[PDB]
Design a protein around this nucleic acid. Sequence first.
RNA 1: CAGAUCUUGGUGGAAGUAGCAAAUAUUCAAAUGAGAACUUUGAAGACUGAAGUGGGGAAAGGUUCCAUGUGAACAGCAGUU
RNA 2: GUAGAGAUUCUGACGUGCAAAUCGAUCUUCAAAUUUGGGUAUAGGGGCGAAAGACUAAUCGAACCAUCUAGUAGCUGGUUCC
Lengths: 64, 152, 103, 384
Amino acid sequence: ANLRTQKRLAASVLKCGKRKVWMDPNEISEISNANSRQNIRKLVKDGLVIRKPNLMHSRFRIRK
Amino acid sequence: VRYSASPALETKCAKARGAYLRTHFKNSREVAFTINGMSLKKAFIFLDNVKEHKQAVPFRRFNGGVGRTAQGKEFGVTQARWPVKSVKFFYDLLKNAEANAEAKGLDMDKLIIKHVQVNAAPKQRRRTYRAHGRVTAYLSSPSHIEIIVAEE
Amino acid sequence: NQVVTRDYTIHMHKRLYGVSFKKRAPRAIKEIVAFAQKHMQTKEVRVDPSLNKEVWKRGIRNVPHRLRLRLSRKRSDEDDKALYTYVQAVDVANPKMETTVVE
Amino acid sequence: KFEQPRHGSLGFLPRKRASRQRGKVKAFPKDDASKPVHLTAFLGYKAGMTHIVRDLDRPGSKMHKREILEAVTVIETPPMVVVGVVGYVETPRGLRSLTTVWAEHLSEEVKRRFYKNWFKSKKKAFTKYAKKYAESTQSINRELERIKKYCSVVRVLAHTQIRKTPLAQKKAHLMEIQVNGGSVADKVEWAREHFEKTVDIKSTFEQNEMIDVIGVTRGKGNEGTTARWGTKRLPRKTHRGLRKVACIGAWHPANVQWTVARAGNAGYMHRTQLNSKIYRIGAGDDAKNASTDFDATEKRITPMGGFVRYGVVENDFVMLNGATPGPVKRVLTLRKSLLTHTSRKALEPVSLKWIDTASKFGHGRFQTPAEAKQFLGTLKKDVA
RNA sequence: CAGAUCUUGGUGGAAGUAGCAAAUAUUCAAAUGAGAACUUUGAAGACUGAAGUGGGGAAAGGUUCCAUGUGAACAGCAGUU
RNA sequence: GUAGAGAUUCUGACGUGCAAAUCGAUCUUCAAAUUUGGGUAUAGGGGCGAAAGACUAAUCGAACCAUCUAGUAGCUGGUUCC
Ligand SMILES: [Mg+2]
Ligand SMILES: [Mg+2]
Ligand SMILES: [Mg+2]
Ligand SMILES: [Mg+2]
Ligand SMILES: [Mg+2]
Ligand SMILES: [Mg+2]
Ligand SMILES: [Mg+2]
Ligand SMILES: [Mg+2]
Ligand SMILES: [Mg+2]
Ligand SMILES: [Mg+2]
Ligand SMILES: [Mg+2]
Ligand SMILES: [Mg+2]
Ligand SMILES: [Mg+2]
Ligand SMILES: [Mg+2]
Ligand SMILES: [Mg+2]
């Protein structure tokens, strides 16, 4: 399957970079059928597509 | 179409050919020269061994700059290579000739490669860009291949 | 009998001893495959992604000198006459151990 | 203008790879019939190098009766086994081998020399010849008789006991060793009596003897003229490289001359080095191999940790002064000298004062395990 | 017509040669597929490091945009893109 | 001294190139006689020139296009069967 479009749409819907989109690797078939922003929104609600957390950048050493 | 030879009984032989095949003419000639005369089953074994780098195709005519290998020893040469792209086309053509022979009911145990010939097909043209705003040829050298297998 | 699992320590340091830094971790992967191919006599070798993580844990240049590996020879989902090895990592305190059979 | 000698010797040409590894005796010493029957050469294995201290006995020298330090080379020389004889007839086209007579039994290591895959073979190498030996024992004696009647030159076929060394190679080295001494009949009789018998190093050479060493040098691969021939480095500014010769010839002759330095093979070449002095012929059976009259410590000739890339020398050995061709573990041919020696340096008796046995795998400071244990006391591992 | 550094076209030896080496760097598993070093997904390792390899515009292009398919030619290796 | 603007040296790389002028390092200038977009004017014996005969679309001690023109050549090359 080719999920390039879904990855792009999910980044728009989640309001994040493509680098933060996580698509469930065990649900490729369901994800590939989306094609619509409304379908992507259902994937997000169902937990098949999520926004990954920001990469860690801690200020502890800097404050110390 | 006419094959370049009929060195066998028409009723006890089979034929296969490929035209305008985009694989190197010079490499294909070396493959053809090596498998010509072989038994069909051993030709398949040898071709698979070339794929695995267990045996090599001696380059006898188009050998300018070809490297040396201990796998040329069995043919008494030092220059040999493993042209797998040409090997694959020959493997498919040999499979086609085998199926053609199975269609004519030949005894699929005495089949010998009796004839194999590579002819240079019309070249396909690309361009390459050279220093000082020049352009020179970047051609391909495709091949016509014909095979005749026959009972020994 | 054919299906068998053993734990091995691979001395990776001597196999990477002069290797260009950009090639060390990718070379370590090839060495593990060749190691399993030799030990289990299986052409097909599969590397657990978690084991790929252990090899690359310190980046591309600094592969651990020794790795404790679990080699499992299994039957593939193709025709059952095909055997392949699955290579995984073993978390141990000191990798300086002998080969041990895993039951 | 601004003369300089040419780089390198035209006597060592071509600088191709040697066609051999063993080391070939090109010329045996002139035969004297008045002497007893003896061997003129031996085969050994380069174990490694160390250094000694000895008192110099050289009147007129500033170091007379003073201590000097000298590098030495240790060659492992277990006894060779005589397995055959070859007779040569003098002809107007040179020496010609008339016939060759072999022993009834040959060990496995020498029979491996006749095979590329001994293991996969049927081991049929001297099986029919051996049966001839035990049928009537008459064609053997006839072949030997023909060497006596003809054959002005007699050489024994001798092979090494390489299995006694730590080398991984099991195939023994075999060579013709000319028999010099009294009478062709006595040479043949001496040879027949030594069939399947060992000849050891102390029966061939002696302490203080001056010998020659023949071997194939260390492989170097290709080298440019700078290192192959010693040509001058061209300036830093040189476009297209500086490790070369600037002008490889004139106009006319319109050809590159054979005397011009060229890049090519720089090693693995056959060399016979003359005048190596035997400082010691060690015995493999005695535990004071490396002891002296001044260093009484019971130690053998193997450094701490073993000879690097060789192992432990448990057999007889020779301790030649200086260097020899070839790397550690290459087989070396020791040959009797063709020259006569009367110089004070050649004739001086050599008595070693101390032989270094510290590790050569680093900056080793202890000669023996006992010295290390005493200096350091006890360690965490030593207690338990 | 043998010539004119002749004209136009075709085709050689040089040759399976020169070479296809700037811009740090890739790896594991899965899916798809006749075929995967190059597609997609997940994981790891990295880089641009805000005077960006980020986000927009002016000029210029003109459909290159998007979806679904294809994979002859082109993408100087490959091709399921 | 950075961005920007240059281009000294290596007489470095490259020199059938990444490139019909580029690449690296080094170097010059860096708040003004500064750098620059767009609009606008000047056209070939003309323009424009802090002047090198420079620049005027890879063209300059007189651009480019077509025509006069199949320009003339005491000069070079060729000039076809027995
Ligand atoms: Mg030709
Ligand atoms: Mg070459
Ligand atoms: Mg180019
Ligand atoms: Mg220069
Ligand atoms: Mg050392
Ligand atoms: Mg003509
Ligand atoms: Mg003419
Ligand atoms: Mg011409
Ligand atoms: Mg090449
Ligand atoms: Mg950086
Ligand atoms: Mg960074
Ligand atoms: Mg954008
Ligand atoms: Mg230059
Ligand atoms: Mg005219
Ligand atoms: Mg004219």
